[PDB]
Point group: C5
Chain length 307, copies 5
């Protein structure tokens, strides 16, 4: 039951895909396992690069196929090489770029935390066991992470385990358990850009929406909410042309609905004030010290949406 | 007439394409069939991975080509292996990601139900018979399906059948019938996002459109419908920048037309009111208890478009 | 001079590209031609699948290369196989997906009819003759064509012909004439979506543009055309975000220009009315029974553009 | 020093890329050169298609690698064949689709003329000489060029020359001079669509911007320029959503800035008029026969931007 | 310990990717190293092109794999050849297009300077030493750089160095030090287009935002800021539909927030003026010689953001 050591060097985790829940990882993979010794030219280890590797497979060098369980579509494999040792051992080393899948909740957008994950397990072998797992995260904690879109939390986390496949066919004598390296990397989004360029102007617009009550007329008050309406939709356009498409409602997404709400609320008050009289055209006018009373009817409903 | 068992493991069904009617399926495929027995090294079954398989084909290992009938463009095949059994049997196992085609009606959007389908049939063989078909849907019912765009209904459904090709050339003695495994998976769209961030604000706008009749003037009434007009078109922009391009009119699509209609209706009434007199500038004013009479002339025409 | 029968099974014609004039075709191709007879194992015909075919070419099986003349870029070839008959004949069968080119006039958009075309001709041979051509269009006339973007007219049309290449070099004794199968398939666009969600609302906007004359003031009349202006541009934004980019002006495209026109016309009248007086501020007021006189100055100019 | 004749058949030049300066060319290439004579089966020349060619290379048929100097990324090569003549000569023929690079000035947009170019030079040889160059442009002058995006000027132009590479290493005895065929094709853009659907409406908007001065009030005048402002930006959105991204300012791009200018000009006049008095609220009113005086202050600054 | 000379010919550096920090490089690479001498046919050096090279590898020609350390995904390799010298030496020459990664700060947008970088280091070898590095930048200083998006600074910079890998396994006797050629090319963005078509009109809008104080009424003043608001958002849409998506805030990005600010400021003043009285409706009116006093409260806060 063969011992395989694995080391994995992660270069970039880049190109997240909000819709498909997908990221890209460029790096190298190394596997070492000891075999029946070999004469090498010199007595120095042998280097077998790229096209040459498949030649030795044809002369019966077993090299096991390790699968990226969670990869989406066969990865771009770079240079590969075998290092063949005289005293048996074999070291396989390749560069790769691959697209990987994990679960990603984006619901608390710009303020999401995420988890980039690798899953390695051999493609046809269960005795054949992943010995130890190492993970060298080139990219450091605080290089200059305010140029990069994500801030990585800790260092790489590991965990080798055993996976049981129930439904597998022609085997019974306890042989359905495969060795699986799992690598996690935690991260948080760089909530800058979205504050300064989304959250803030959305708020200014929301605020200045409320200054409708400081209009004197009723005709004035009613007519410029329709402009405020248009202003939200305009801003909705803007968000949409920038933000990552999703199938759920982000934080920003709600803020936007709050806008649509406050303004439709206003239209209700504003028309109510005018026809809540005894006479005829007595504007309630006492309502409009909701002037700065329903801004904090909103900061009330806005400090509620933090639970 | 050869017996082939098939097992198909579906990992994700992702990336639907509304326009092309097309989805992506990542998973593995397995085929097992028993041949004339063989000496394996040890007496343990043989593993033949990737490049090595095509070598055994050259020494006459038949391995039949099974075609994904409904795939659009040759699929990304990952690791493949042959497991060669001493007592004859052969088990072929590959990982794949492929783009598939089925019919998809999107007409009742955000509220559509769909059917993701696989079709497997051997590429050159009719005796040669798909024995039994299995389908292991990793993804469970209620994992956390409100992160995922779609909620899958039941478990996978099957159906092995026989397909007769009429127009096939140089054969007559009853040999035009091929074995075809067909897999279906039912699903419904996660109608959240579209309610909360589309149907709802469209409604608020439609509503507040109606508050035009609560304007005192006529000049007031006529002029702010043009702003309401602009507001629909603005919102039409927004839907368009988010929603899946189609060649028919979805539910949302109609709502948007209703907006355009209510507002063009308004312009008709509002101008009719002013010149339906018999003096000169007697505003009908009794019409404008359509104030909250043609909102439910719309909720009438809106409860009609469900049947 | 070799007889080659061809059959072509078309699965989907999808993914049209208005700019590049390009469509996608998924289907199978078959070629049969009879050779000098052969011993087949059994006396039943031989099946040679995929990788194995190129092996037989190396031992001198001629298999002719047939070219898709009008394809843009080498097509995605699926499974292929040779069926080798004992009595000589050979049947070549492959599945393919390829992007093809034909001339496409889009000028009368949503209402365009088109012609999807295949052109097959052998790549190096002129004696060597395409015997007969067959075309099985799986997709029927009225399946449910109102889910699909196009409605196909008839059945597939054929035509085998002879092509003469003038400028070809080292041959003169009358040998510049190649055999070419041509397949056509007619189609019309599903003019639905564009009526209901473009032609119509554009019309409503165009109409309600005209209700500017029913404004009392002059200041009223001039000021809200600027809003009508904005409304056309807003709608132009909308069409652009949805419709297929082209290098000519479609029907819809013109409608939009008509909008820009009627509104600029209005600004001319409206300003003329005010300063076509005798006194000073006598609004012509008789002009403004162009109220519902230049809507049918437009339906006049609109029933003219049906050439 | 080997004589190689080259013929190049151009099928489509399509898919221009304004940003990257890049077009696509689908066509065939032919090369003929005479070698030491050969026994062909029959005495008729030999046809070697596709996979078979590389076989002859391994038995020492030299076939030279000709490079597309100005291609971006290795091109899609279709069917290739060698025609092997008994009397020595060899004719290489392949179909190709490749993306090419040339310098492209887009500064005078919709009215740009361009030059589609091919550059062929052998990859490792300088004795080895391109004999003569031929270029058959299938696509004729006036087929129906008003469906196509570009109108090609002349016929294809040629030029075989000699290229000297200074910095090349291990050679000195005058051997740094390589044979290079260069093909040019001139073309002009189909300036239709952009006149009718961009230049014109931009003008109408620009014009109707000027009708601000025919407003009576000052408050009227100032307020509806802000709507005119919005109108330009609205139209800037529209251009952007349609026009090819570039890193310089096209003609249209300037027109748009003219708009922003005229309207910002207006705001200056309009506010100047009101406060350039000999009292308090005396509107200069004589200025506002810039009514139709600064439209031709613009047609003055607009006939300046042509030379 | 083998001496390898390298020459690198850069053709285009194009297609930058702001998000991913990524550019494309098309060019050629050359490596020369001297081996144990060889009989060449003739006594003239041997040319081994493309497919043929891998043949010589199989007969034991070492050719070392050199890695592009900083490339994102395996590059498109074009023609390759070996030139085999009788007196030992070997010259390897290939054409390539590759996507490369470097750190890119975009914070001072349109006015960013950048650094295009190549990193070459052998894939399995440390004795084996990069002799000297040469870099021929075809593209000159002032060709016509105002058609191109970037202006390159100097000429190519070099630097061969030694890299120590700490974590490498089965070696200790001082053998973890690899030879690495590093190429830099400096560049600045063509800040034209963004001045003329972004910075400028944003300024005009910003300016003309200030002409709100030259409105007489209060109702006038408050209502047309909402239109100014809309105007910023409209312009924000425009920038977003054109500019490169980033995860930080560019210069233009801030300007846009300034706009939102000045306009929200205005709304504060404008409402303050009206209700900062002694009496009731005394407009402060003395404030509104902030008319042209807070434009330079902004040019004050705008000359502060140059640090
Ligand atoms: Na857009």
């Amino acid at each position: 039951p063969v011992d395989v050591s694995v080391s994995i060097f992660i270069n970039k985790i880049y190109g997240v895909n909000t819709l498909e829940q997908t990221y890209k990882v460029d790096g190298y993979i190394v596997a070492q396992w000891t075999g029946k010794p070999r004469k090498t030219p010199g007595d120095k280890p042998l280097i077998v690069e790229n096209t040459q590797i498949e030649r030795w497979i044809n002369n019966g060098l077993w090299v096991p196929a390790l699968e990226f369980i969670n990869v989406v579509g066969s990865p771009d494999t770079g240079n590969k090489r075998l290092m063949l040792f005289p005293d048996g051992r074999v070291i396989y080393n390749a560069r790769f770029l691959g697209s990987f899948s994990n679960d990603m909740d984006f619901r608390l957008f710009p303020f999401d935390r995420q988890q980039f994950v690798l899953e390695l397990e051999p493609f046809s072998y269960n005795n054949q066991q992943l010995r130890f797992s190492d993970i060298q995260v080139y990219t450091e904690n605080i290089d200059n992470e305010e140029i990069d879109e994500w801030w990585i939390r800790g260092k790489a986390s590991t965990h080798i385990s055993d996976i049981r496949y129930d439904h597998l066919s022609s085997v019974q004598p306890n042989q359905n358990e495969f060795s699986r390296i799992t690598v996690r990397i935690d991260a948080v989004r760089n909530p800058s850009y979205y504050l300064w360029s989304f959250i803030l102007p959305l708020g200014l617009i929301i605020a200045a929406s409320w200054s409708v009550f400081w209009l004197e007329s009723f005709s004035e008050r009613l007519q410029t909410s329709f402009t405020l309406m248009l202003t939200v939709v305009a801003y909705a356009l803007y968000t949409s042309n920038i933000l990552p498409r999703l199938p759920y409602t982000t934080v920003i997404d709600q803020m936007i609905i709050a806008g649509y709400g406050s303004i439709f609320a206003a239209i209700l008050l504003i028309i109510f004030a005018h026809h809540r009289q005894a006479n005829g055209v007595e504007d309630d006018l006492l309502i409009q010290r909701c002037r700065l009373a329903f801004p904090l009817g909103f900061l009330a409903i806005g400090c509620v949406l933090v639970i």
